[PDB]
Amino acid sequence: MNIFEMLRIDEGLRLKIYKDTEGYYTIGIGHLLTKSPSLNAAKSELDKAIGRNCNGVITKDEAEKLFNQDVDAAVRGILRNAKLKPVYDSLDAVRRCALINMVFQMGETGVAGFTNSLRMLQQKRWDEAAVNLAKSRWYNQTPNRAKRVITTFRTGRWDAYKNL
């Protein structure tokens, strides 16, 4: 298992513009297009993103291309972030995937806000950090996914994703 396979389990693949758990316009493998309520604003962002007139629909190929860019940007954002970098560097390869997953879902900013859990992950207090991460809007709004990510940080293994 790797970051791509992991995210693809969590996000799914949809070739037609769709709405987020949050109600936001998205396409592909969890590629948010706009937080704006117009399908029209979304379509426009889509065409801008792909470089063609898509009419709200993309190919598998275009979905994977957007996915590769998004993953690359998530990693690079972690590496550029003063709060995230040190945690990332401290972690093993599997746990690094769990932090990447959070950044992809919620953005650098959002994750950098989990001050206390970050501190615990740096200290390698796995059980404590898993309890602290669960105390969040994130866990309450998308519990099955948060639970997979959390198990990943707790164990350092891919068990949560075996089932799936």
Curated annotation (Swiss-Prot):
Changing E11N: Loss of 84% of enzymatic activity. HAMAP family: ENDOLYSIN_T4 (MF_04110). GO terms for cellular component: host cell cytoplasm. Optimum pH is 7.3. It comes from the Viruses. It comes from Enterobacteria phage T4. It holds the Pfam family Phage_lysozyme. One of its GO terms (molecular function) is lysozyme activity. Keywords: Antimicrobial, Bacteriolytic enzyme, Cytolysis, Glycosidase, Host cell lysis by virus, Host cytoplasm, Hydrolase, Viral release from host cell. Changing D20 to A/N/S/T: Complete loss of enzymatic activity. Its EC number is 3.2.1.17. The keyword Transcription does not apply. This is Endolysin. Substrate binds at L32, F104, S117, N132. Changing S117F: 10-fold decrease in enzymatic activity.
